[PDB]
Amino acid sequence: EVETFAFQAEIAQLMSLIINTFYSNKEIFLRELISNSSDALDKIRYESLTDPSKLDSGKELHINLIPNKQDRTLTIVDTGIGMTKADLINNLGTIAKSGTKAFMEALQAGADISMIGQFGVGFYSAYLVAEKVTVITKHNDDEQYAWESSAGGSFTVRTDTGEPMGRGTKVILHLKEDQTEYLEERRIKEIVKKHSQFIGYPITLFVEK
Numbered sequence: 277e278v279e280t281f282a283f284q285a286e287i288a289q290l291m292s293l294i295i296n297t298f299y300s301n302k303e304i305f306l307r308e309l310i311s312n313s314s315d316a317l318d319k320i321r322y323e324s325l326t327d328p329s330k331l332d333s334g335k336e337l338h339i340n341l342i343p344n345k346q347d348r349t350l351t352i353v354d355t356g357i358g359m360t361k362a363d364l365i366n367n368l369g370t371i372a373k374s375g376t377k378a379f380m381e382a383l384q385a386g387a388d389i390s391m392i393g394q395f396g397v398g399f400y401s402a403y404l405v406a407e408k409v410t411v412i413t414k415h416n417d418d419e420q421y422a423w424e425s426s427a428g429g430s431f432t433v434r435t436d437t438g439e440p441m442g443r444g445t446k447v448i449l450h451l452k453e454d455q456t457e458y459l460e461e462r463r464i465k466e467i468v469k470k471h472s473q474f475i476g477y478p479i480t481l482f483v484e485k
């Protein structure tokens with residue numbers, strides 16, 4: 277059972293701007309998503325200080341980067357707090373509405389796309405390099421869900437029946453045909469070193485077989 281939803285108008289407008297604006301500095305998408313993973317790890321780490329049982333679904337706090345040249349995907353996995361169904365459908369977008377409005381006004385006044393994370397909506401920078409984004413996620417308080425969008429104004433949410441995840445979020449970037457540099461081991465290492473060197477969790481770049 278798959279449910280289809282319209283993005284809020286402001287968010288569809290932002291994703292169209294991200295997809296259609298000429299902007300060569302696309303590598304910042306990786307910084308934004310690692311930053312989001314780090315925040316999610318911070319949250320479950322803090323919650324576990326007063327309720328240790330929150331780590332029953334997995335004690336390791338880490339980020340894995342998994343390029344796949346055959347599928348042309350780059351996957352960013354974290355074992356952070358995860359997202360509920362309400363997060364995916366309503367809560368995160370409600371928050372994103374005001375950050376989007378502020379980011380688009382800032383762009384009008386001279387900001388550039390790389391400051392997108394200062395407005396809390398860096399997630400959407402995934403569409404700099406991906407034609408489709410799938411997000412698999414499991415929060416301690418909810419079931420495992422898959423969120424997916426190729427932009428165009430809509431997204432889907434379904435119960436996920438793939439491999440159980442324990443807890444956390446997996447962002448699967450289905451890369452555009454001309455963006456396969458982000459599957460190359462040395463390019464990814466360069467970007468992580470440049471932008472994410474001080475992230476406080478182990479980042480493991482998987483190599484392909």
Ligand SMILES: Cc1cccc(NC(N)=S)c1
Nearest residue numbers: 364368369372397399411
């Ligand atoms: C995976 C997903 C679902 C709904 C909203 C968002 N947006 C941000 N996180 S700003 C992301």
